Design a protein around this ligand. Structure first.
Ligand SMILES: [Zn+2]
Lengths: 68, 117
């Protein structure tokens, strides 16, 4: 049941409120602006937005990590 | 017209052609597949309505206004538990877009006459 070594946590998906405005920046006029990068390959669609890493960009499915 | 819109929503639920949720709606607009949508105005959303109107006012998207976010959870069927009666545990949603493939219906002529004119 319980071991002497303490239990380690798992990567649980937490609750984030209104994450889409973190991507689509609401500007003044009626025009959409995208800050985070997208996957340029034709394997996955443009609607999937890739990860915003501080030194690179992580592809969503193909793991094609783009470096500066 | 509300009966026709509910029939369209029900047959979109039957054929599973609708893209429920703001994530799938943003996917549909980024793939340019926004035909009809429902917006709930006069709500308690502080700044979400500006983003929803900004995405809805982009390219050939219908402008339909309803009253509440929590009244749209029963037509889409987010938490329609105990279908023989009234649900007791339910959450809400802002907008659910539809991408209907079986467009041919009975009142769809009046629907497209109202949408075009
Ligand atoms: Zn991707």
């Amino acid at each position: 049941k319980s071991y002497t070594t303490p239990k380690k946590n798992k990567h649980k998906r937490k609750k984030v409120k209104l994450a889409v405005l973190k991507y689509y920046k609401v500007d003044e006029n009626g025009k959409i602006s995208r800050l985070r990068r997208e996957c340029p390959s034709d394997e996955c669609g443009a609607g999937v937005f890739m990860a915003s890493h501080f030194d690179r960009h992580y592809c969503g499915k193909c793991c094609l990590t783009y470096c500066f | 017209v509300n009966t026709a819109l509910q029939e369209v929503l029900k047959t979109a639920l039957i054929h599973d052609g609708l893209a429920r949720g703001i994530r799938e709606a943003a996917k549909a607009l980024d793939k340019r597949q926004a035909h009809l949508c429902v917006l709930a105005s006069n709500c308690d959303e502080p700044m979400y309505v500006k983003l929803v109107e900004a995405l809805c006012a982009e390219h050939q998207i219908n402008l339909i206004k309803v009253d509440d976010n929590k009244k749209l959870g029963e037509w889409v069927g987010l938490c329609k538990i105990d279908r023989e009666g009234k649900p007791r545990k339910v959450v809400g949603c802002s907008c659910v877009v539809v991408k209907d493939y079986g467009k041919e219906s009975q009142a769809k002529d009046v629907i497209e006459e109202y949408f075009k004119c």
